[PDB]
Symmetry: D2
């Protein structure tokens, strides 16, 4: 198994039997003949379903609630004995226009949560118009939504969807939430929107240019990435390193499925092995 983490070995250890290091960076990365992908010529390839969407809709709200209630700020103030609540005032989500971009299973669940906090949940998707959301056009979402959260994949025209112009059309004070893909956001324009005060906040789980940075302990150096250092510096940014999947259920499932997938290709190397 390639990029192995201890949070996988807790689940992936007791369920592996029969025949038989795991140095990170032969399974996944997010020579028998099978590559066991763990995301969501022929050189036999498989993949993991499920991958728990709940863990990502939960994180999405967690990160967005942390930002609006400024739990990142309070954390550092209370460590210092500074219990003055200045700069930690947020808003009630109740009555706020929540905007969901991408109405697959993660966007839907997020709209389910957002609905319960008392938001008016707008949403946009070229296919499916779910009941959970007042489906509207993208431009209307962009300009009317107090909160936008991105739950769509990254396509050639999706890149930098949030850029200097989208930031200009957005409601002043708006929170932008992204646990989908970092490429959907022009980090430079996001920092300029955040610094100038047009964008009220941002809560990111993903980051264009995250590749060699996330999932690794760079503690001996520090932050060499210029944009990451600026994101973490602003009070109105919350950021986590692509951990929106990291739940016991999701990992136990990723781990248990990966084992079955091998157990399927060795019980019969010629097949559809479910998640080919």
């Amino acid at each position: 198994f390639f990029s192995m983490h201890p949070y996988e070995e807790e689940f992936l250890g007791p369920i592996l039997p029969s025949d038989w290091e795991m140095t990170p960076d032969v399974v996944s990365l997010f020579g028998v003949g099978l590559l066991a992908l763990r995301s969501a010529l022929g050189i036999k390839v498989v993949n993991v379903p499920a991958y728990s969407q709940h863990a990502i809709a939960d994180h999405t709200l967690a990160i967005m609630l942390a930002l609006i209630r400024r739990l990142h700020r309070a954390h550092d103030k209370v460590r210092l004995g500074d219990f003055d609540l200045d700069g930690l005032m947020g808003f009630d989500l109740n009555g706020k226009v929540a905007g969901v971009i991408g109405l697959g299973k993660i966007g839907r669940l997020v709209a389910t949560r957002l609905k319960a906090f008392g938001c008016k949940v707008l949403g946009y998707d070229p296919y499916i118009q779910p009941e959970i959301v007042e489906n509207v056009d993208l431009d209307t979402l962009i300009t009317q939504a107090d909160i936008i959260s991105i739950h769509c994949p990254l396509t050639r025209e999706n890149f930098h969807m949030f850029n200097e112009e989208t930031f200009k059309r957005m409601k002043p004070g708006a929170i932008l939430v992204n646990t989908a893909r970092g490429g959907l956001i022009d980090t430079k324009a996001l920092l300029e929107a955040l610094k100038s005060g047009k964008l009220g906040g941002a809560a990111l789980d993903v980051y264009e240019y995250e590749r060699g940075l996330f999932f690794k302990n760079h503690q001996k150096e520090g932050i060499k990435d210029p944009y990451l250092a600026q994101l973490l510096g602003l009070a109105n940014v919350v950021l986590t390193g692509h951990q929106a999947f990291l739940t016991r259920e999701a990992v136990k499932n990723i781990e248990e499925t990966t084992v079955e997938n091998i157990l399927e290709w060795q019980k019969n190397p010629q097949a559809k092995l479910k998640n080919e």
Copy 2:
């Protein structure tokens, strides 16, 4: 020429007190909290408006009675910090803010909760060093977990409405209300079955230290306790012991017994002298906030508007509505 001084003023407050919304006209504001060292700032004011960070004991009230103060406009629901009996012997009316935003408290409770389960407090500190390793940062899906709400007023109902949208099985206990949003069970069933417990009840003399050693022994191993209600409900020593031992998975706290002079104040010059607060903050399965569940624009607007209403209304008649 009617003079009102505001003690323990904050920017998040003065920005929402309208202009001032002239209740009475002459207005002085200080960020400084009220005690014997500052009471004389109140000379000439008939109204003194306070926050929980202010101390109005006997000595301070005797000094306010002799400056002509007639009204104490408490910018809070709590009146713990006021010697009410002495102020009623002096003739000073006390008025409070009785209704915050219930949505603000519910929303903070969830925030505080997901912060703990997704280990956001640990990630915060990890990434500032460049440690983007995810070991130590795994949580669990609220989906399917059993969530137990204690106290089923609007706060508790709103908290249960949120949790149900995360996939939670929501249990609740409350002898005086049985809402449809919850499977009403018994308190012992909530204690023993719940993955996550959230408290949303007042404090009574039978309530005090409800979460004690025995209560922690009966809760499910690895359980999450969340307290935005009142810090008295939890025995902090026992909580610290249950947390260091592994029995309790985590705690998320907005309130703390012994907060009655620590919270709401910048103790930056010293640090954390409190023995229990220090051990709490260094623990990886604890999230903690300084009683900020109410700290939203919408709730602060309410508090200020109401305080303006309470002074505008005050005319020596015990129909002060929000009198105590």
Copy 3:
């Protein structure tokens, strides 16, 4: 009446006591600009800090109140439109010499925190991470330390560095103290393991530490700046820092500090592009221009300010401009 803008408790603890009763006194922690100049109405003396902005507009408003004295609680008149104040007729007075012992001590403090990697350990331990990896430094013993500028501050820093076992080189075209091996600047630049600047800023000094200067310094070297932020090109420092050519930087001053330092920006965070990148770097250490922030030096600033106001009548003062 005397009004004090940008008052601090570490200041009022010292000038407050007795405060030789020159008329009625008012203090605000708030800093002076056009939104707050009103508080100076009725005052004849306005006392400032470097967090206060007194440009043309604000001086024309003060002049119209009868203010006749600017009591600057600092050495720098950088934040005062001096020519407009001299055209309006407002006298300006300052505190010329802090304590130099305080600057020298803070220089060494900030240096030893960088070299012993206390900033990293600080954050490590708070998480319960007592693993010493990433925390190794080196002995000051036998290292070559280069001091640039040899006034009392520079001399007092060499006096300290020599007690850590350091070989102390120094450059200064004026005076050659015995505490130091006087060398040429290029020898200091190329040979020093640790460099500490303690000179003023000239128009020929500006960005003295640029890319070229960083290319010429010894691989792995520690630079230290308690003097003036102008002397270092921050962009080049950041590049030298991210590449490994520069072992580290410890900084008390920063170009473009002139509106950021000395103010609580907690509500926002760090908007400055360079500050965020500096703080995220593990070989930095940075402080908010607090080299002077000792009781002894602060007592000096307040006493000298009291002396300056009491002295003010109408003749050119000891510390006029």
Copy 4:
């Protein structure tokens, strides 16, 4: 044959080559850092200089004799200057955009009475630094009265020193030397520095002297009860030690995890010396 290995040791142990034998070094608490009866058959490359254990080789039973005393006297002052100049506090403020210098005021060391307890090589080096900062340096030692220090009685150091730093070994009479009584006797506002031994201080009474405000500050690299805590990453749990959590939470405490030796010169010496000592026992 190498136990309790750290990467800062591996940087140096390896280039010098331990080996053309096979050795292998796995870290876990014959290679014996500070971090037993039932020893099986044997054949002790301590890589230390301490008595954490009960041909005549040049360093005997094989420890590292020399070390770096500068590493510890440098760290001693670093820690001490960090606390007086409140660099821990500023570290956490500036991360927030909070550049207000309130609560970071220090004092000039110049003119302050510095007090050194134990006047061997670390204390002497420490007093040399301390002398250059402008301090009047006192010192106490039962043997030797160096001129670097105005030698005085222990009681006179305790009560007159603005700054105390401990540089003596821990003896069965020395345990809890800094207790409730010593803290009543010390000067109001004094800084206490300990890079020697944690047992020399009663942490509980230190926490009370600090909380009460009798003690102006404390700067520790060593801590009684540090054993299973220091040199280990406890990031998954938090800080379970009640006294450590309280120490870390005060603004007038600086603490570091026994890192006063961690310098390149010190570790290269410990590494080169260990190798030399094995090369001396194989040529017996």
